Each structure stands twice: as structure tokens, then as C-alpha cells.
Amino acid sequence: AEWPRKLRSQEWYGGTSRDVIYHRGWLKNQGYPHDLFDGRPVIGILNTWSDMTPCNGHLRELAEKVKAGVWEAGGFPLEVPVFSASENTFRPTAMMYRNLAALAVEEAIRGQPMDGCVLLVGCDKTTPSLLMGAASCDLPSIVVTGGPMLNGYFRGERVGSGTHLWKFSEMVKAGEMTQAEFLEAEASMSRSSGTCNTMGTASTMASMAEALGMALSGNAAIPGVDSRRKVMAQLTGRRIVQMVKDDLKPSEIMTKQAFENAIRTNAAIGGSTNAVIHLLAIAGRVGIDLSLDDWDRCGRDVPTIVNLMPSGKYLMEEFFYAGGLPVVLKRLGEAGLLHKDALTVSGETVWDEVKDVVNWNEDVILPAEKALTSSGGIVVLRGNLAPKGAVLKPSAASPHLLVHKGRAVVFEDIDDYKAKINDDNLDIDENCIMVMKNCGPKGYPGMAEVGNMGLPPKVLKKGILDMVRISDARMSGTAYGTVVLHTSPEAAVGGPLAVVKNGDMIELDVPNRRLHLDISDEELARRLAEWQPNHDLPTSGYAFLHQQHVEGADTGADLDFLKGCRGNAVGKDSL
Amino acid sequence: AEWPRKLRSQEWYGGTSRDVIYHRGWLKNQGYPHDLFDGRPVIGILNTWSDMTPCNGHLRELAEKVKAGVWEAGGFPLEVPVFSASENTFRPTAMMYRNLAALAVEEAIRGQPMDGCVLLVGCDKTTPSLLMGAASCDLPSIVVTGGPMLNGYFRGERVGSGTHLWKFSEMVKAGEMTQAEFLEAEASMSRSSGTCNTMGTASTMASMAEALGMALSGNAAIPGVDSRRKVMAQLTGRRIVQMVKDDLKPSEIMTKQAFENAIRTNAAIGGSTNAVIHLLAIAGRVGIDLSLDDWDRCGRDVPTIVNLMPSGKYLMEEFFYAGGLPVVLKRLGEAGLLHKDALTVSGETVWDEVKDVVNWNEDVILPAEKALTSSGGIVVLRGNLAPKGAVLKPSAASPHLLVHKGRAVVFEDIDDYKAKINDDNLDIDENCIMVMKNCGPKGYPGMAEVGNMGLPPKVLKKGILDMVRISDARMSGTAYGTVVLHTSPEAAVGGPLAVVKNGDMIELDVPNRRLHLDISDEELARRLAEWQPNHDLPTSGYAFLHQQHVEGADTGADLDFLKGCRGNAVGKDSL
Amino acid sequence: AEWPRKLRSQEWYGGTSRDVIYHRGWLKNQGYPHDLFDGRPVIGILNTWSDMTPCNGHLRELAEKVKAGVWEAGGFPLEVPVFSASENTFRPTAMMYRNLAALAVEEAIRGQPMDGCVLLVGCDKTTPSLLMGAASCDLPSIVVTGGPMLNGYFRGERVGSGTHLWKFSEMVKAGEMTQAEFLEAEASMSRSSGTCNTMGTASTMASMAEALGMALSGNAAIPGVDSRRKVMAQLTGRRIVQMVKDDLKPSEIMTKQAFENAIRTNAAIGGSTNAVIHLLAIAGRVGIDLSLDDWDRCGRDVPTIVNLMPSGKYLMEEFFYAGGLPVVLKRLGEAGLLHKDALTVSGETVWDEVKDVVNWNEDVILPAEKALTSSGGIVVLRGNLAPKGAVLKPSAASPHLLVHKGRAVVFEDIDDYKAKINDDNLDIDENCIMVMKNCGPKGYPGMAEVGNMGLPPKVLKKGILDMVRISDARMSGTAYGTVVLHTSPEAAVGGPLAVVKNGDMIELDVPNRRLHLDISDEELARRLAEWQPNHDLPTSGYAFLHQQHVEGADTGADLDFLKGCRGNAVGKDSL
Ligand code: FES
Ligand code: FES
Ligand code: FES
Ligand SMILES: [Mg+2]
Ligand SMILES: [Mg+2]
Ligand SMILES: [Mg+2]
């Protein structure tokens, strides 16, 4: 596009009408030179900082670095806080507030005199909520990630965010650790400012951001407190001004190719199962046709080569010193698995960004023959038990359980699980299949990370730590096990998983992508004909709104009316 | 000056040596793009903010604005706290520490990789101490003034910072007010963030710096919380980068013409007497030839026209709304009393910055025919009693006492004064002459603002509020009365003032600039013969340093070994 | 100590006089409830933060954490920036300004209404300068250390702060490495906020302050960006308030035993040679008699068990995770080498603080029988060549060189060596004694860190990296080799070292603490008798102050008029 030209902020700040004396005159009450309003690019810095989002606790400092970049680059920077859907404070689950955050972000961008956006995110759900909202305006935008925490440690041994909460609490159930030992691990578990240091949802959506092209190369793995995270922020501030002038919009970056790059990247890094739901959501805002079948297709025969927990051994620091995601993207290109000419916010293709990087540790970023799995992509299972799809993370499942048939042990909701799971009389053993209902988008409500249900203590004491588990919930990106997730449609809407009865037999078969309830079709229609809701039914509030409008996990669990891209047209004026 | 060129900051940050890797490499630990060390101007922003300098309490917010401007102009901003000699916390008196703060500032500038300086100041002694430090280096520098507080308000009346502290405290012991009522005025007295709102030292020094050309036009009177003060700071951050490229140095702005512009401006505004001391010290560092007589000469027949406490009626807000110092300066050029071609930090002559401005309240900036005084300049008296000079602020004195003769009532030090003044048995009437010694630079120590002695209560209860007062002390810029100050040599070093005796007659003659002790030259000669120095001289500490090196107030009371300009040659390196 | 009682801040802020109405009314312009002036402890938070002290980059965040603690404990926190003698910026050498900064710190304490102090330090010379300053007032004070940077890395390997600086630049001279390779490591060398991460001066002075009891247990090794740094700062804020109420003064803490504890801790951790100078300076302000001989006696037979560069293999991170200084202090006590009853700022004895900690890594905090050295204490050599003492750090020297005789190669000043060192025709071998003069306190001036002269490139290429080097300079605490330092008296004040000529025989016998010039008493007699002092002594500014008053390195290189403790009596009032 051509420059100079009238950007949308001049609808507020250019000219001489009483309307612009009002807008420009009132903002000057903070000491701004008059020429800031001359039509140079006005940059919104959307900031999800918050004392109650501790994973992003340093993003105010990151914001100052972005500002200096905009100043240098000739723009007018302005910081705008936005909804921070913090993973560790929000109950019933931060997943419930992702759409709300996206709503507020979209309105905050379109409603106000900003020409381009910088999106400062970190904790799990902040990255997709802000990308969803900016995609619905399609103004030039760029991601700055806060970064992982440093390695935690306990008893001279490496500890990873989340993954060891599962390990320790199971160990405690198995009699291999006391709750007091667990407590002492607390102080050194999260011990710098940043996001979970395993390959959880935070680290995955940072990789997805980088691999879509929405952040400068290297953005994903730089530790939160590392000097170069602040360099990257300043340089992002410089770039965005230039991006506005050129008019490099999100819709030119996140192409079908870009989404396929991010999908094969999730296989390579052992990405979290929530990337499936978020990438779908984000694509539904950009306007790209993207389905569960693209996920399954693209991740097939892509080895998981990044050696981090929960699938592997190390944490985010090692991955960063190994060279980070640009080394994964070079590999994907080297193996012919990359759209090399995808565009990035830098204005270079992904290949031209990464072509010359170096793997500094083949124990962290593995050679293709020593991968954790030769087909690392998440698998989509279908069948009468999950007619709209269900997913599993192969890089952290048990091989002997990937095909398995056992007797169903049913929990009607999460409170049903917590009541029975420790009962020593619970009729369950290691061959059984644990099934849980009503933990989906409408059922939980919010689709909580509870599908990685803990094992019966009496199985754990035989030294068995895995079992086939099925639910319509999610699990943490930090979790592991042979867990079948996102079962669609969810029970709370009369999907077949609502009618599963104890004793029923179920067949899992990953190679044939098959999830089967072994009852006749007559018995199924009969059970389903008697379905009813067995979950909470809100009468008002945002909970009501969510209950009425949230789609299923198989499409991204967006709100139906919030789908797609609504543009950035300035409204009528306010006076 | 050649641009581009290698600036002194490149001695630390330019090239590929082991030494440059150390220096550049370490600063980089804060997140700085490598191109910031490529030779752009590095701008040190010297901040006198401290939680214990309340008058300067908003300087952090101002420093951020200076940084923004620097980034804009393409320099490299680095904030650098420096000693803040707060007038209302430091005891025995901030004056003692003025030189200490100029020493620290001078070394902080030369010892580190600044190419130009920004001087963030406010409270009384911060302005002179930072200007003294920078003059001794002569790197491109520029001033940002903190700004005066809003008006105080007690019982619907205007209350002024300082001036009403003396008015109220004398009314208390006159029997016209109670301390209880004095205390009620407290919280509405100093009720915004900034300096004293009268025409005191901070308002005078702010004007001095503008009048010298060391600060952008309009700097002195903007209220501290007025949004146009932050605008001023941002524009100053832009322009310091350009002065470094151009090499606009302090020696080039503070010429002799500049200093006379300053002296004539001080008479026009009825400025603080401390302006005399501070300005002699500053010219002491630039190396300009400036003397007491220059002061008497230049303020002669310059009418005081700024109707502000303590000479006049209103406060700094009123001054700012009428037009601030630019009006005053223009009137000086219209009157033939301005060096119109003296150059300023802006690159323009002073006349060019002021010649078009508009006086918006002649009740505040008075026309010459209504001037508070016809000869507004501070006067210098000489005579056997002050061989090296004493000063008096006529625009806040009583005309009928400017020629007076009377009986000496003599106080040996400040304890003796406090011990005697309120004694109704003291032989004193309104026609006597109050004399105090041992309050000078070495005597007090530090030359405290105690020269405006309170009158004896019994005189005050006659409705009388002015008597002639002589001492070696200073007085606040906010004080008033017919007060003879800065008497040199001070008693502590054996000046004539030391041998004045109760009952001696003294003659004050201001038109003839005479201050005469009426005793025979043989009698004064022998009285001095028995003079002995003070006891309990400080044997160690800064107090020791000050006792050995401070000069008399007749020259600026700098330290003898700190006079002059030592330049800005980079030192040897530390490895 | 009685509580409640009148603290010294009430001299400014208690009661009803106009003097107090001025002090208290003016600070209230920043918005403080009246009751904050009720006499609760006013805590001065002395901050050495500065954009030009990048090693202390985060101390503003730490200051806020301290304030919060002071609020919680019921005090009135006020932050006061103070001189910041940044090692990586100041030139000629930050050591020149260590006393300047102590001067400022002292006056800012006694001159303002603070009842207690928190010292926020990091970079080498900040820790000692605020400790000297606070020692000369004796108000209750407590230290907060910034903390070290995270490990650096190059080519997947660990790089140490400063230590790898000397290492790499010597490999370039010996042909094993290019300047351009050197430059690549720079971006990953200093990669988080904090101090040098070897066992250098900052690490050592932080350890000395914990060893002294002047800082809370664990204070020393917590990295800058580690979340327990912020906890410690808030815990310190709480504690100082109580210290003021109890009146726990530094003279109560920094006892002879406490200094012994510090000297022995230095040996155990292989600390910097600069601790010898800084500890004596600090003792000179407290009034405790302490000598170079105390040093030699106390470190004898104390093995260095901390296996960090430059002496060992690892960095501060690993030291932190092994258990830090508490584990070291604990071991001294287990070996009978600890004053277990020395009292700390917490009101507990050191042994009571550390007696239960756990060594979490025997490779980093070694067992005695695996120590780097069995007698790790710094050694004090005497002899005709250093009649007043010289020092050497055994834990990082070559043992075959601790008893050696050789021909002297004499550089008369740092410019002399800089011109001679890389000339292949320089007559020198791996058995000569590199001697260099005129780098002492007065000579450099400021006693730069240059005693560890880079070897002759032709020797380095034979694969030799160590030679006996002797001077009156310091070296970096990150330095290694068989280096003799602080040779007293210095050459510039006519000490023997001044007169060595090439070819003189010098003997170094460390086990016998002897350093000998092999010439006749008469020939040395004659040599000195015709010695002239340096020409071009500085005649103004701080350089003159320094030339006139700095004592020798053998007493800590204070200024003579600053030694001792002048207390905290509030001065006369300013009005
Ligand atoms: S809890 Fe915030 S990233 Fe996991
Ligand atoms: S006390 Fe600060 S300007 Fe008067
Ligand atoms: S340069 Fe600051 S600790 Fe080394
Ligand atoms: Mg999550
Ligand atoms: Mg004053
Ligand atoms: Mg050092």
C-alpha cells in the first residue's frame, strides 16, 4: 500500500473539526507533542499483564521495551490492558473465559484510534484469545510472548511445570511419596517470571504463534527473564510501525499453508492437545477452512523430535539453548514437510528466516532416527462413540495401550469421579477403561483439564501408571498418558458418550483411528432416545450466554455469533 | 560540527576489542538492540528525584518523557540518579551540600559514557548544583525544571509556600494567630507535586536557567502537574540529541551577555537573594568573569514588575497564566536592557524566542508605570562592616528603612538569638539594628537561611513588622523585610562583623550603597586584634572538607579546589 | 531498647512548631496520611539503581518489594537514590569513586530524617561504598544483594562472566581463536539482569555481607531474576522496621568475630583479592582494628571448597542450587572454624541460621579431602620489595610457581606494558617476573584492575598460560594466575617497587610469605634516595581531592579524613 496515507486513527485526530479538537485535545492532557497526531502510525499495545496472571508478571516491563521500539520507528505507542484469562487463578477453568477475552479484545481494537497492534501474551489462554480478537479486526498485528519460567529443581533433580504435579500426586497415591515431601517441592517449582517450562499449552501456542508467522523468528523459546526477550520486544515495537505503513495484515500471514506449518510443528515439538482447539478457533476468525481431518492428515509420519516433558526429558531452557523452534522449522523444511514460502510479519518467508540456524544439542532436538515417535502428530479418532471426533497425543501415550479393548468404568461427572476413584471397593482394574461425562464446553462448564483422570490407587501399587481414559474434557498440555480427549459431541448435548453404561465394552485402535462402543445400534438409539441434561443450567449471566452459544470442541469451541472477521471500519462518531 | 562523527561514548561502545566487548556486552544485559551502540548520541538523563525530595517527586514521570523524546530523535537514553540536595529534609541546611552534589554530578558525567546531558531539577539547590557540575564538563546540556506547586488555600485566602510561614509564625507571637490555627493551614499549604509557589529560590533558579538560555523557552513557570510540563520534557528529549550532533556546549550559551541577561531578569521578577550566590558559583565553573559589582551595576534601575509574593500579591500559577518569563524577557528587550542576540539551547537567540509573546494579565506582569519598585535589582553594600559586600532585596524591603541609623542589638550565634529574642527584658525597640554573627558558610556551618530574624514580640505587638537586620547568613527566597544578608567576610573567619558590640551605632544607606559601623578605625583595628577562631572545629568527615575549602559567599561559596572547568576527556580504561 | 521512644525522624516530623509544620507539610505534597509522621520508623531505602549500572538493573523492582515489607511492618518507607559506582562504566576505574560514593551515602543518611536503612547493592563497588557510608553513621542498616546473572553459554558450553573474558582474549593472542569468534559469544555472555556470575568481586562482596551478618541468611547467591530474590527483599523490608525499634546497630553486628568469620568465608569460597581492601575500609569505618596480618592468619589452612570459576569449574547458579553460602558457613562450623555465636541482622546467631541446611551437590560445594586447595586463604607477602604488604590468591594460582626466582621485566606504567607486550623482540621468557609500577591508588590513579597482565604472545604459543606478575594494581575478582598484587607502598609514593630495573632478581616464596628484591641494602638505599614523584599532579576537582588524601591499599585505600565513625546526631535546623 502507499505511504503517506490517511490511517484510521485520523478519523479521531486529523484536522480541525470540533470533533477532533475533542479527541485530540483530551488525549493531550497527558503531555503529548502536537505532531504525534500528524498521521504517523498509532500503535495499540494490548497487554495481558496482571498481578493475578503471575505467568505474565513481567509484561509491563516488556511493554516499556515495545514502546521504545515504536518511538524509534516513528510511531505513537499507547498501552491498552485487556482481559487476562489467567490459567491458574480462573475457576471453573480459564477455557471458559477465552471467548470473552477475544470479544473484549476485538471491540477494544476496533472501537479505538489504533492503526496496528502489539499483542503481549503468555499464560495458556492469552495467546489464542488475543489472536482470535485481532484476527476479527484484521488490522496489522504482531505477537510478543512473555516466555517460559526457568528450570525448577527438587532434591537435586529437574522439575517441570505441571508434569511433576501429576507425577508427585500419583506417587503420593501409590505410597511412594508423602504429601509433606510434595509441599517442600513447592518453593522451587515456579521460581522465575514466566509460563510453564514444559511443552504445555503456553509453550505450544508460542510455537504456534511463531510458526504461523505472527511473531519474529525465535519468539517462542526465549526464557521470560532472559536479556534477549527484551531485545525481541523492542525490535517488535520497531517492526509494527513499518507493518502499518505497508499494511501487512493478519489475513496475509495466516494462510492455509501457515496453518499446516503450525500443525506439522505441533507434531515435531510434541505439542499440547489444546493447540487443536485453539488453531481451529483462530482459523474460524481469519476465515480459513480448517478441520480435525487436516490435523490428523498433516501430523501423520511427522516424528516428535523435541525432547521435552511431558513426552520426553528436558525443559524449555534446554530447548532454547539448543536453538529453539527455528531449528525445528529448518528440519521440517529439510524433510520436505514445510511450506517454505509462507510469509511472516518480518516480511520474509519462514524458510528465509530459518534456513541457516544450527542445532546446538542433538540430545534436546533429536535426529530423525532417534525421535520419540515416528508419527508424532495428534491422532483423530472416530466411531459411534465419538461421531464428531476425539483426539490423543501419541508422543506421551503408552505403546501397548494404543490398541485395546476393555470394560467401561463410568463416572457421571467430575464429582462422581472424586467420590469413587479412591474407594478400594471400586470394581476396577488395569484392563478397564475409565469414562467421564459432562466435562465439555457446556457440561463442566468450560471444558476443564480433567480428562487425564488419576488412576485407582490399587492399580498404581502394581506399578501401573497408565490406563485408557476417555472423556469430553481436555487435559493439560503438560499431561501424559493414553488419554482420549475432546469427545464430540459432548455428553451435555446428547452425544453418545452420555449413554455409556458401566460394563459396556469399548475398543480403542489408534492405527485405524477408531473409537468404538460395543453395543448394537438399536440399543444406542434406545439409550439416546431417553437422554436428558444432567449438568448445571444457568438462568443468567455470562455463564448463561456461554451455555447458549458455545460450539463443540470439534470446531474450536468458539461462540457461534463471534465467528469470522468483522473488519476495522471506524464507527459513527460519539458527538 | 561534523555529523556523523565519533562521539566520546564510542570509547566504550565502538569497535571489536576485548574492552568494547566488556562494556557493550554488559549493558546489553538489559535488552538493548546492538545498533544502539553504533554511535548515535548517548544521552544521560540526570535525575534528582528522591522520595525525600518531595518538591521533585514527579521527576520519574518526567524522565520517562525525556526518554521518549530521545528515542524519537534517534539517540540512546540512559537515566542516571544523582545527589538531590533537598531543602526541606537536609540539616543543617541544603546549602552545605550544594557543593557535594556538584562534585558527584561532575564525576558521574565525565566518568561515564554520556555524549550529552539532561538536567532534571526543581528544589532550590538542585538547579545550581547540577548546572555547576555540567559546566565543569561542558558537554551539551539542557535543563528541565520540575515546576512549582499549585496555589495553597487557607480560609478562602491565598496561602503561599514559604511567605506565609513567616507571616503566620510572626502573627502567632504577635498574638493575632494561634499555633492551633497555624496547624490547620498545613494540609492545604503544600497540596500538589512541585516546588515552592512564591518567587523564591526554586522559582528564581528556574527563571535564571531559562534566562541564561539553558532551557527551552517557557520552562520556568509551567506548574509541576500541568500537562504542558511533560510536553516540555519530551521536546527536551528530542532536542538534546540534536545539540550533541551540533556540539552546542554550555560555554557557548553561558557567555557574559547570558549572565547579565540573568541579572537584569532577576530584578524584573524580584528574585531570591540566593540567586546571587548560586549565579557566582555557576560562572565560577563556566569560567566567566562575574562579580558582585556586576550584580549591583546591572540591576540598577530595572523595575520589578512581577506582582508575586513575597514582593507582590499573587503566586506562580498567576505568573504562568499571564505568560511566564518570556513576557518579562520581551519587556527587557523592549526596554533596551536585553542582549537580544544571546544564544539559547534551542539554536535561536533569546530575542527570537520571546519577541512575539503576549502579556495576558497586566495585574500580574505589571507595566513599568505600576512597577513594584523603580530600581528592582538586589543591591550590594560595602563599608568597614562588610569590606567584601552584603546584599539586600529592595523590592521586598521597607522604603523608610533604606536610610537608617540605630543602636546595635547583637546576637553571637543562632542559639544566642533564639535564647534572647523572646525575652521581654531585652533592650530593643523598632529603631534598633539586629546583628547576628557565626551563621556563614564556615560559621553555621553551611550558611543557613536565618538572616530574616523574627522581630522581638514587643515590637511586633506595636503593629510593627520590619526592622533592619544584618548577618552573615542567607534568607529564604520567600522571605521579606529590610534584611542585610551575605555579609563578607563572615564572623567565623574574622570579618569585621565579628567584633560588633551591643550599643555600637550602625548606618545603612542603600542609595549610596553604604554599610558603615560607626567606630574609629583604631578601635575596630584593635577589636580585631583579639579575635579568636571558633572552638570544636570538625576534625573529620565531609564537615571537615567543607571547613577547609569553602569560599566566602561574596564569590559563590564554592570549594576552592572545585572552581573552573575540567573538561570531558575520557579517562584511561579499567582493563 | 525502649519502645515506643522518640526516634531521630521526630526531630523533623514530630509536634507542632513551625519548623515541623514546614518539614511535615512539604513531604505531604506527595500524598501521605498524617499518622505516618507519628514516630513510627522512617526507613531510608538507599538504591544504587541506574541505567548506567546495568548489573543492578532490577533494583527498582526490589525497592518496591522492600517498601511493601516496610508498610506491612508499620514503618514509613522512602526511597533515596545514591551514587552508583558501576564497574563496567566508570573510567579511569570505579575504585576511584568508591570513596566519593561512601562520602555521599554518609551525608545523605545523617543529613535526612531516616531512622534506619536498607542498602540495595550489586556491582563490585556498590556493596562496600554503602557499607562504609552506613558504618560511619551507625544507624541500624541491612543489605539487599541484587544477585548474579544466569550462566552464559557459547557453542553449547558454559561461559563465565569476566573469567572467560581473560581466557578468550588470551587464546586470540595465542592463535587458538579469532577476534570474530570472540565477538559471537558476546550476545550470550551477559544474558539476564544481575552481577558477574563467577566468584568475582560482586559475588565475593555479597558473600562478605552475609558472612558479616549484615544481610539475611541466603542473601548472597540467589540469582537476580530468581523469584526468591524478591521474597528476600520483602522479608528485609519487614525486618529493618523491627531492627529500628530494637536499635540493632552495625557496631553490634560487625564485631571482630564477624570480621574473622568473613575472612574465613573468603578462603572457603576462593574469593576476590579485592575483599582484602574493601573489608579493611569497612572495618576502618566501624572502628574495629583489622590488619593485613589478621587476613594472613585467619585464612591459613582454610581449604577452598566452592568449585566455581575462576578458581574452579562452575558458576553462581550451581552454587545457589547446592545450598549457597549457608552451606559453606555451616561447614566452617563443623570444622571448628566459626564464631557460631556472632549475631546477625535477624537477631539470630549465624550458626543458628545455617546449622540445619543441606549440601545438595558435592561436586560444587566440595568435601574437604577434595578441596581445590588445603590453604585457600589469600596470602600476605612481605619483604624489602613490599615493606607494607602484598597479596596473592592461592586457590587460582599455579602451584609450581608459588616458589620461584626470576629475572625482572619492568614496565613503568600501563602504557609502557601496552606498547611492549606484543613485541616479539621483548626480551622475556616463561621464567621472567613481569613487574609493573604506577598503577596504585595515587598512581593510576584509582588502582585499576591490571595486575594480571596478559602474557607475552610468544610464551602463550608454547602453551604456557601462567607467569609470576607483580605490581601495585588490583586485579579482577574473576582473574587467575600467579599474580602478586596491592604492593605497598605504591610506586607513585616512593615505595621500593618504584626502583626495580630490568634484570633485577626477584624471589617469591609463598609458604614463607616472603617477596624479595635481590639487591644490596645500600643499592636499594641509593636507588630510592634519587627518586622523583610523578609530574602533572592534578591541581583541581575530585582528582586533586583524591591525590591529596587516599591512603594505601594496605589499609583499604580510604580517604584519611573519612576514617572512623561520626555517628548520627541530628544537626542544627535549616530555619
Ligand atoms: S499456569 Fe500460566 S502458563 Fe501454565
Ligand atoms: S523546599 Fe523545595 S522549593 Fe522550597
Ligand atoms: S561488572 Fe558489575 S558485577 Fe562485574
Ligand atoms: Mg492449560
Ligand atoms: Mg531556599
Ligand atoms: Mg572488579
Author numbering:
A (entry chain D), B (entry chain A), C (entry chain B): 5 to 579
Which sentences from the paper describe this structure?
An L-arabinonate dehydratase from Rhizobium leguminosarum bv. trifolii catalyzes the rate-limiting step in the non-phosphorylative oxidative pathways, that is, converts sugar acid to 2-dehydro-3-deoxy sugar acid. A quaternary structure of RlArDHT is a homotetramer, and the active site is formed in the dimeric interface in a manner in which an N-terminal α-helix (particularly residues Arg22 − Trp30) and a C-terminus of one monomeric unit contribute to the formation of the active site of the partnering monomer. Each active site contains a [2Fe-2S] cluster and a magnesium ion. The last residue of the C-terminal tail, His579, participates in the formation of the substrate-binding cavity of the neighboring monomer.
To study the detailed effect of C-terminus mutation on the three-dimensional structure, the crystal structure of variant H579L with product analog 2-oxobutyrate was determined. Four polypeptide chains, or a tetramer, were observed in the asymmetric unit. In the H579L variant structure, this helix − loop − helix region was observed in the closed-form conformation. When the His residue is substituted for the Leu residue, the interaction with the Glu453 residue vanishes, and the side chain of Leu is rotated. The rotated Leu side chain also induces the conformational change of a nearby residue, Asp23, from the recognition helix. These subtle changes result in a larger substrate-binding cavity despite the almost interchangeable size of the residues His and Leu. 2-Oxobutyrate was refined inside the substrate-binding cavity in chain D of the H579L variant. The oxygen atom O1 of the carboxylate group at C1 position and the oxygen atom O3 of the carbonyl group at C2 of 2-oxobutyrate were both coordinated to the Mg2+. In addition to the 2-oxobutyrate ligand, the residues Glu91, Asp128, KCX129 (6N-carboxylysine), and Glu453 were coordinated to Mg2+, leading to octahedral coordination geometry. The distance between C3 of 2-oxobutyrate and Fe2 of the [2Fe-2S] cluster was 4.4 Å, which would leave sufficient space for the hydroxyl group of the substrate.
